[PDB]
Write a protein that binds this ligand. Sequence first.
Ligand SMILES: Nc1ncnc2c1ncn2[C@@H]1O[C@H](COP(=O)(O)OP(=O)(O)O)[C@@H](O)[C@H]1O
Ligand SMILES: Nc1ncnc2c1ncn2[C@@H]1O[C@H](COP(=O)(O)OP(=O)(O)O)[C@@H](O)[C@H]1O
Ligand SMILES: O=P(O)(O)OC[C@H]1O[C@H](OP(=O)(O)OP(=O)(O)O)[C@H](O)[C@@H]1O
Ligand SMILES: O=P(O)(O)OC[C@H]1O[C@H](OP(=O)(O)OP(=O)(O)O)[C@H](O)[C@@H]1O
Ligand SMILES: [Mg+2]
Ligand SMILES: [Mg+2]
Lengths: 208, 208
Amino acid sequence: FLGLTLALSKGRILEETMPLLRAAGVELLEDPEASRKLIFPTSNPNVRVLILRASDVPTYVEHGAADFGVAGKDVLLEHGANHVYELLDLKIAQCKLMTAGVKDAPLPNRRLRIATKYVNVARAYFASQGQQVDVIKLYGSMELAPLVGLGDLIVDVVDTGNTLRANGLEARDHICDVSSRLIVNQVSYKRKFALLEPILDSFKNSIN
Amino acid sequence: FLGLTLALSKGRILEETMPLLRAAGVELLEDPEASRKLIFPTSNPNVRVLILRASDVPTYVEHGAADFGVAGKDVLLEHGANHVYELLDLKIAQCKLMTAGVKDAPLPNRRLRIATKYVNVARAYFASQGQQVDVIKLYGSMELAPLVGLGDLIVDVVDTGNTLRANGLEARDHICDVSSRLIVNQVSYKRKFALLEPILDSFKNSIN
Ligand SMILES: Nc1ncnc2c1ncn2[C@@H]1O[C@H](COP(=O)(O)OP(=O)(O)O)[C@@H](O)[C@H]1O
Ligand SMILES: Nc1ncnc2c1ncn2[C@@H]1O[C@H](COP(=O)(O)OP(=O)(O)O)[C@@H](O)[C@H]1O
Ligand SMILES: O=P(O)(O)OC[C@H]1O[C@H](OP(=O)(O)OP(=O)(O)O)[C@H](O)[C@@H]1O
Ligand SMILES: O=P(O)(O)OC[C@H]1O[C@H](OP(=O)(O)OP(=O)(O)O)[C@H](O)[C@@H]1O
Ligand SMILES: [Mg+2]
Ligand SMILES: [Mg+2]
């Protein structure tokens, strides 16, 4: 396969990317949500799709296992984006990185413990507020951590706030806005520009 | 809540732990698989259950957010087990950590690239075979990596081998056997032994 490999994740990124792909002449031939398969052809024989965990999208793209991909800004910040090119803000899967804690709970008298999957972002954010914190790395369900006393605050993505409210948590600080971004492998950009360019141009047009 | 908090993960660990818990006088009051909730009461008011991602079970237990938990040996090896006590091999969720690659593909002429979530285990295993390797950290779907040239081999858990065979991969090396283990917080063991002891004794009896 000499064409382009596009890395996407299931759920909202796949759902919100499909219209952009359609407008660019690229449609999946089945629903990846209902398949155990991971590589999918498209209506365009020069483009195939990898379905990955969101956290693996930057990894595949960086290493050139995919030529390009759609990754949340949150994942990019956490992973590090210095070995891919971020070409477009697609303005999909929009949310924000925030700190949160138990509603009205005071902070304890010591170095704070932050429970989060976004360990690098958490460290950098608290450092920008003048604080060195301990970070506890979690892989899921951040909202539970404050309720059982694992960490004093969490760092997580918030959209509606329903998850925080359902668990008696409140957002404390706004870290940054997050949206999904189009990222490209630095070599693929140079060597497969002829294939990439119309798709990138289509995406840019669609997001206007 | 002054009783015991038990950390479990969904799927096979929950499924294979429930009979042990039943025999110990502990039953869930609903199916956690069909709930968004994360804390669950049991038939015993001294015991509640946290449902966590498997990789977070050791974390919660180590930190004392749970008093005890059931974690796969694979997760324990990767996370590090020096700040919990491993008390029982429950002999559930039995599988093995293995290396795997594309069937009959020769190794390349350079330092190997291992794609895996088990980065510490991979490093230690290849070091025991006389090799320093590069490790690429992945969070899911290891089987895809060799097929798109991300890494030369993977390290993953294998049971039937169906996943490897479905993807044209073959197991190369047997790293170790894996089963789920009962782990306890080092302080909880000391301070809540009266609550723990009958449950531990019941589990031990059940697994005989
Ligand atoms: N509630 C939300 N609303 C909008 N965007 C979100 C929301 N939650 C996460 N996102 C964004 O969408 C991306 C897709 O990730 P997601 O499908 O939740 O997978 P994962 O659970 O593996 O992070 C996230 O990395 C983030 O940028
Ligand atoms: N196919 C399998 N058969 C038996 N045990 C398995 C299998 N796959 C994983 N396991 C074991 O069961 C544990 C439960 O993890 P699992 O439910 O697969 O969650 P995750 O996908 O987050 O690792 C694993 O950490 C491992 O020890
Ligand atoms: O502010 P809200 O609108 O509640 O969104 C916040 C939640 O959205 C995401 O969950 P997702 O829907 O991806 O489910 P999961 O992360 O629990 O799998 C994220 O992990 C937060 O928990
Ligand atoms: O040798 P096998 O019998 O095929 O088992 C191996 C597979 O089992 C586990 O997958 P699981 O069923 O937990 O699904 P997931 O890891 O893809 O979520 C593991 O992640 C392997 O992919
Ligand atoms: Mg999610
Ligand atoms: Mg699994």
